[PDB]
Coordinates of C-alpha atoms in Angstrom, one line a residue:
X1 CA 77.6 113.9 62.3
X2 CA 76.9 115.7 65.6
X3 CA 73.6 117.0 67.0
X4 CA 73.6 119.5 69.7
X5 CA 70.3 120.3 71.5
X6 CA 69.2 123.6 73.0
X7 CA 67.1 123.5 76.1
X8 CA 63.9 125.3 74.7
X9 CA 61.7 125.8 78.0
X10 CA 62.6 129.8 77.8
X11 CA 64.3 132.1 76.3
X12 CA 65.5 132.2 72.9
X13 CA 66.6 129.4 70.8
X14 CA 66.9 130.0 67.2
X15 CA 70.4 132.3 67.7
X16 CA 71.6 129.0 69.3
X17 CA 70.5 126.6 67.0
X18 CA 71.2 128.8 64.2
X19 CA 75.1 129.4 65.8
X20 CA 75.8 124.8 66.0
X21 CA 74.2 124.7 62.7
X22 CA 76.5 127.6 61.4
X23 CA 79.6 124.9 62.7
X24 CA 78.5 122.2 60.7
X25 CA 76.4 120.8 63.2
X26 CA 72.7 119.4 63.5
X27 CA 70.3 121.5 65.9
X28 CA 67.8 120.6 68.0
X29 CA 65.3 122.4 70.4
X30 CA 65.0 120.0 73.1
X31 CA 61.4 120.4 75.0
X32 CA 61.0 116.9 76.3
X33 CA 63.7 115.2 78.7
X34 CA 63.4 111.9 75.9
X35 CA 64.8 114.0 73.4
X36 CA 68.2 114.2 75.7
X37 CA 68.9 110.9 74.6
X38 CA 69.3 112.4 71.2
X39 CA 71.4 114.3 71.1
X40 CA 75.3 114.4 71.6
X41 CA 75.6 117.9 73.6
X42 CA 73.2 120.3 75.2
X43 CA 73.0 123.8 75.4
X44 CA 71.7 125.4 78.5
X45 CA 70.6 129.2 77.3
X46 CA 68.0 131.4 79.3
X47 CA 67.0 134.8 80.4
X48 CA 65.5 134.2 83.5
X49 CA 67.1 131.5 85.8
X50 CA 64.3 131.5 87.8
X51 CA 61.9 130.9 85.6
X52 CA 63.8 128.6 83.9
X53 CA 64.2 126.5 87.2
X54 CA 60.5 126.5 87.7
X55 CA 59.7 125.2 84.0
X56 CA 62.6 122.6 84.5
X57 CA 60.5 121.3 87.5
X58 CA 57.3 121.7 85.5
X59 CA 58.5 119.4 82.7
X60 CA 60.3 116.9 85.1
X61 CA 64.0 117.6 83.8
X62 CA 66.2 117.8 87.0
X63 CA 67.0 114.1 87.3
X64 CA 67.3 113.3 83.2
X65 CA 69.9 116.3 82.9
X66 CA 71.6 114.5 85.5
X67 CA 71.9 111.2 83.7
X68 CA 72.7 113.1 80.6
X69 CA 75.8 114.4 82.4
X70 CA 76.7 110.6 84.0
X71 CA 76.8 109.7 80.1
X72 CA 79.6 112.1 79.4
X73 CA 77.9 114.2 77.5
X74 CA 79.3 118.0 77.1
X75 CA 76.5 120.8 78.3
X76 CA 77.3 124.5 77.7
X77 CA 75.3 126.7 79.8
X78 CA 75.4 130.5 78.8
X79 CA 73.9 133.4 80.9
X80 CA 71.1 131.6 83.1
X81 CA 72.1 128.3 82.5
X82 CA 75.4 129.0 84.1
X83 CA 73.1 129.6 86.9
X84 CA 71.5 126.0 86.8
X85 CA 74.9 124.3 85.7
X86 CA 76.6 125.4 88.4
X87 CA 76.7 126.4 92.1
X88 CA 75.7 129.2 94.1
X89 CA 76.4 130.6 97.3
X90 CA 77.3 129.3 100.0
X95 CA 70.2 124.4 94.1
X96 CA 70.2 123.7 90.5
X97 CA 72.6 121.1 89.1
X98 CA 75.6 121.7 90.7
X99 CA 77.9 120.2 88.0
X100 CA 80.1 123.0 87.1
X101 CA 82.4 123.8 89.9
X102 CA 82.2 127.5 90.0
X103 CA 80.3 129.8 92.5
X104 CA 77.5 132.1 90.7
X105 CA 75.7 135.1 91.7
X106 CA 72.5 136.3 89.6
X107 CA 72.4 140.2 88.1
X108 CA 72.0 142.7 90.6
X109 CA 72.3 145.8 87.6
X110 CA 69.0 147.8 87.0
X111 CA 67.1 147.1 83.9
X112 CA 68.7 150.2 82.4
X113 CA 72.6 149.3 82.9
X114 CA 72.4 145.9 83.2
X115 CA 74.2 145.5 79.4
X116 CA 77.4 145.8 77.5
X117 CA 79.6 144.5 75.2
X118 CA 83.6 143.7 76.0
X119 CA 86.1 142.4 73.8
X120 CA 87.5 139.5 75.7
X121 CA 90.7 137.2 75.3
X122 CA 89.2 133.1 74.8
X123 CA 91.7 130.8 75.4
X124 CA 91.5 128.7 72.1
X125 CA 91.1 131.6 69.6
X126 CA 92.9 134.0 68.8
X127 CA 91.5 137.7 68.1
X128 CA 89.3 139.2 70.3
X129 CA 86.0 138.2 71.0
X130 CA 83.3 140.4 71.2
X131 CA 81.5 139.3 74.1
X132 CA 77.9 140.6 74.6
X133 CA 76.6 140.7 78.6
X134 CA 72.9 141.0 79.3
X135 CA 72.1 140.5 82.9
X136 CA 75.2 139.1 83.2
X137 CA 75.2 136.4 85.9
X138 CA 78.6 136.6 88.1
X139 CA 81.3 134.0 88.6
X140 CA 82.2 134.5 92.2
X141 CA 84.9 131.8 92.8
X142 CA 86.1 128.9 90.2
X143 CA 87.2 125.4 91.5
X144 CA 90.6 124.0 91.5
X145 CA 89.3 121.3 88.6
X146 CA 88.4 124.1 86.7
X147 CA 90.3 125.9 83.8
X148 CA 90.0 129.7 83.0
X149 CA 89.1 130.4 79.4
X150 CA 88.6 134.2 79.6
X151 CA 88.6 136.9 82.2
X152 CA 87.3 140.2 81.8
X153 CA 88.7 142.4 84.3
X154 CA 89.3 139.9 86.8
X155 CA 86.2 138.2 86.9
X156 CA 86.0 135.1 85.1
X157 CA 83.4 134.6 82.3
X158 CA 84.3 131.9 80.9
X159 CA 85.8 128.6 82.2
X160 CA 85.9 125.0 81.1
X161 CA 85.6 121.9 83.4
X162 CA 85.6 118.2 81.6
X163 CA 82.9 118.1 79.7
X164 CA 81.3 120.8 81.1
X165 CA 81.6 124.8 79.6
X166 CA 80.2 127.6 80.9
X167 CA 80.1 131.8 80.4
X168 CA 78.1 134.7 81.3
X169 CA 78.3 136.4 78.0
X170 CA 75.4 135.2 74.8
X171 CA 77.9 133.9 72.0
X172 CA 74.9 133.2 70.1
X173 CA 74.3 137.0 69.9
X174 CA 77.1 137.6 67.1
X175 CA 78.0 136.4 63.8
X176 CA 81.4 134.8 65.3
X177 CA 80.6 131.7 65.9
X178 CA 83.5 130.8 67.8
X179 CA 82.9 130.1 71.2
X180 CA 80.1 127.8 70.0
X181 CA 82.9 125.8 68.3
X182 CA 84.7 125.3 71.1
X183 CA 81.6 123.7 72.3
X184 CA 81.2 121.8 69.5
X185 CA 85.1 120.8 69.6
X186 CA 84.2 119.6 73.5
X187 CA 80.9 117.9 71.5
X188 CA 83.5 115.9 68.6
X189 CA 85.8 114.8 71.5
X190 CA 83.3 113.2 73.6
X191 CA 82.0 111.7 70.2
X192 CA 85.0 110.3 69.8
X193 CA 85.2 108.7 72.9
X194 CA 82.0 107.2 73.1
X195 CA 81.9 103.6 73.4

């Protein structure tokens, strides 16, 4: 069976774990770039991007996340870690093909919940945005799973997932299996 890892430098974890274990996955909170190599997928979670960025520096994980995507193996970043998954205007890793912008809301409006249309389920999915990072422009290799009026938040690229909604922060575990889904097919694949 599968083990996902979470990228446990900051921010919360135990949502995420507890969300892949809830799909009949194993969880682990990855705090040492050697513990990439065990596991199948990685989830990239977060607060604070920049923050996060530093401590990814700190503990030396630019260049292993790098080799972990050359492997094949799916990464999901959510909230900040579409921020280090993807590009921005116009560093981090650059592997996701889709422009972001970082919060600009106040600290008392910055949050809300949506109900969004996911491509791959099929009632609503209540989508809760803290701080919400901003998709400002997806690549042509990349393929829309939700839009919330007209922005995208959340898309899908190979191996690669991304949204700027926590689906960790909800009993509906959903979007998590999608990841895991990705997680299975790349399993499958391996040689």
């Amino acid at each position: 069976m599968l083990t996902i890892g979470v990228l446990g430098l900051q921010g919360a974890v135990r949502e995420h774990i507890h969300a892949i274990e809830a799909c009949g996955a194993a969880g682990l909170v990855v705090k040492r770039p050697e513990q990439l190599n065990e596991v199948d997928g990685l989830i990239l979670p977060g607060g604070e991007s920049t923050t996060m960025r530093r401590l990814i520096d700190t503990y030396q994980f630019m260049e292993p996340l790098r080799e972990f995507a050359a492997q094949g193996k799916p990464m999901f970043g959510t909230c900040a870690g579409l921020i280090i998954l993807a590009k921005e205007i116009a560093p981090h890793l650059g592997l996701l093909n889709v422009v972001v912008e970082r919060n600009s809301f106040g600290r008392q409006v910055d949050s809300f919940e949506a109900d969004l249309t996911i491509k791959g389920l099929d009632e609503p999915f209540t989508g809760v945005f803290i701080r919400a990072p901003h998709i400002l422009e997806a690549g042509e290799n990349v393929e829309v799973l939700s839009e919330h009026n007209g922005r995208i938040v959340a898309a899908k690229q190979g191996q690669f997932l991304g949204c700027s909604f926590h689906p960790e922060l909800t009993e509906d575990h959903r979007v998590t299996q999608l990841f895991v889904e990705m997680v299975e097919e790349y399993k499958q694949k391996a040689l």
